[PDB]
Amino acid sequence: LGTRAKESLDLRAHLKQVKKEDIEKENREVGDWRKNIDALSGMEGRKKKFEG
C-alpha cells in the first residue's frame, strides 16, 4: 500500500513539476508592460498644420 501510494505520488509530483517549470520559465518575464502615458495634461502646445 505504501509503495503504491509513493509511486503514484511521485508520478503526480513529476507531472506537476513539469507544469511548474513551464510556469517558471515564462510567467511575467515579458509580462504586463504598461507602455502608456500620463495623458500630458500640461501640454499646451498646439499645431496649425492641417495637410496631414
Binding site: 513539469v18 507544469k19 513551464d22 510556469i23 510567467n27
Partner: protein, 371 residues
C-alpha cells in the same frame, strides 16, 4: 532559439512564445473589407482591416471569419491573418522560429496539408508541427489520463485519453459550438423586439451572450421561475444607448448545448456525448475517465456549467462511480498553455517536421510518422 506556439482556433487567434504563462497577443480572427464608397481623399484607407483593428471600425466593414468549423474555407484570408499575427502582433520574422499549430480532430486532410505547405513556402519557417487541440488541454491540467471536452467556438470535440495512449475509436466530434449559440441567441432576441441582422451586430450579440447568459442547473424550474417573478431580467446598454432587458433568454441560449434539438440538430447534448465517448472505451479504464473529466475551450466558461454537467453525468453513470469535473479558472487559454508546455519539452525537440524532410516528401509528410 524559442518556438512560436500559435493556435489558430476559430474566433480568437492566440499566440505567444513557448515557455510563458499566457498568450502574448489575443485578437479576433476576422478580415473585413470596407463596403461603402469613401469620399475623403488621402485619409489612408486600407483595403482590409484584420484582427483587432476591424473590431473598432466594424461600423463600416463586413467582417467575415476565415474559419467556419475548424476547417479553413478561405485560404487567402487565413494567410493574411497569419501574416498579421507574425509581423505586427509579435514582430518576429518567421525565418528564425519553429511553429506549433493546432488542429481539431477528424478534420479534412487537405486543410492540414495546405496549412503546412503555406507555413513552409510563404512564411518559410524552419520547422512546424501540428498537434490535436485536446492533448494540449490535457497537458495544461498536469494530468496524464482523463477525457477532455474542448468546446471551442467552432467545433466541440471530446477526446478520451488513458495513460498517454489516446483511443482513436472513441473521439466524438460535434459541430455545435459558440458560433451556433450566438446565432441562436440572435434568433431568440427577436421575440422581444430587438433585431440584429448585420454581420457587425453579431459581435454585439456575442458580447451580450458573454456578459449575461448562464447555464441553468435545472431547466424546467428556471423556465417556471422566469415566467412568474422578474428577478432574472438583467439589462444591458447597447453601443449607442437604448438599454435592453433580457428575460428568460439568459439561460435558454446556452441550454442548446445540452439539447441540440433547439437549433434543429439531431445529436445529443454535450452531457450525453461524453458518456457515450466513455462507454466506447474499455471496461477497465472507465472509472479513471469518470473521475478525471476535463473541461476546456472558451464556451465552457458559462457560469454554472460545471455543476449542470456533473449532475447530468451522475444521472447517466452508475451510482457507485465518482464523477468529478475539472474546471480550471484558466479554461480559455488551456490549449495554448498546454501548447507552450509541450513546445518547451526536451523530449519533444526531435519531433518537429524539419524543412529538409518536407523537401524530400512533399506536404504529405504531415500524415507520416511526424504526425
Amino acid at each position: 532559439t524559442t518556438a512560436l506556439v500559435c493556435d489558430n482556433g476559430s474566433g480568437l487567434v492566440k499566440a505567444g512564445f513557448a515557455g510563458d504563462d499566457a498568450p502574448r497577443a489575443v485578437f479576433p480572427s476576422i478580415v473585413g473589407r470596407p463596403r461603402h464608397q469613401g469620399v475623403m481623399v488621402g485619409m489612408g484607407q486600407k483595403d482590409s482591416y484584420v484582427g483587432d483593428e476591424a473590431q473598432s471600425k466594424r461600423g463600416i466593414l463586413t467582417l467575415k471569419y476565415p474559419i467556419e468549423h475548424g476547417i479553413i474555407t478561405n485560404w487567402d484570408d487565413m494567410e493574411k491573418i497569419w501574416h498579421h499575427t507574425f509581423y505586427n502582433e509579435l514582430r518576429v520574422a518567421p525565418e528564425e522560429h519553429p511553429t506549433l499549430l493546432t488542429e481539431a480532430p477528424l478534420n479534412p486532410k487537405a486543410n492540414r496539408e495546405k496549412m503546412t505547405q503555406i507555413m513552409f513556402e510563404t512564411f518559410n519557417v524552419p520547422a512546424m508541427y501540428v498537434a490535436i487541440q485536446a492533448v494540449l488541454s490535457l497537458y495544461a491540467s498536469g494530468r496524464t489520463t482523463g477525457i477532455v471536452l474542448d468546446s471551442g467556438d467552432g467545433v466541440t470535440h471530446n477526446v478520451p485519453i488513458y495513460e498517454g495512449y489516446a483511443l482513436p475509436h472513441a473521439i466524438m466530434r460535434l459541430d455545435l459550438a459558440g458560433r451556433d449559440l450566438t446565432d441562436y441567441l440572435m434568433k431568440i432576441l427577436t421575440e422581444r423586439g430587438y433585431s440584429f441582422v448585420t454581420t457587425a451586430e453579431r459581435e454585439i450579440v456575442r458580447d451580450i451572450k458573454e456578459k449575461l447568459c448562464y447555464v441553468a442547473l435545472d431547466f424546467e424550474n428556471e423556465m417556471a421561475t422566469a415566467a412568474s417573478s422578474s428577478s432574472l431580467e438583467k439589462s444591458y446598454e447597447l453601443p449607442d444607448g437604448q438599454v435592453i432587458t433580457i428575460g428568460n433568454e439568459r439561460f435558454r441560449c446556452p441550454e442548446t448545448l445540452f439539447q441540440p434539438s433547439f437549433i434543429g440538430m439531431e445529436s445529443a447534448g454535450i452531457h450525453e456525448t461524453t458518456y457515450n465517448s466513455i462507454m466506447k472505451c474499455d471496461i477497465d479504464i472507465r472509472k479513471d475517465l469518470y473521475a478525471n473529466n476535463v473541461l476546456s475551450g472558451g464556451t465552457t466558461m458559462y457560469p454554472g456549467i460545471a455543476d449542470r454537467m456533473q449532475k447530468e453525468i451522475t444521472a447517466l453513470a452508475p451510482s457507485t462511480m465518482k464523477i468529478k469535473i475539472i474546471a480550471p479558472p484558466e479554461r480559455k487559454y488551456s490549449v495554448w498553455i498546454g501548447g507552450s508546455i509541450l513546445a518547451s519539452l526536451s523530449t519533444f525537440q526531435q519531433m518537429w517536421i524539419s524543412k529538409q524532410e518536407y523537401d524530400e516528401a512533399g506536404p504529405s509528410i504531415v500524415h507520416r510518422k511526424c504526425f
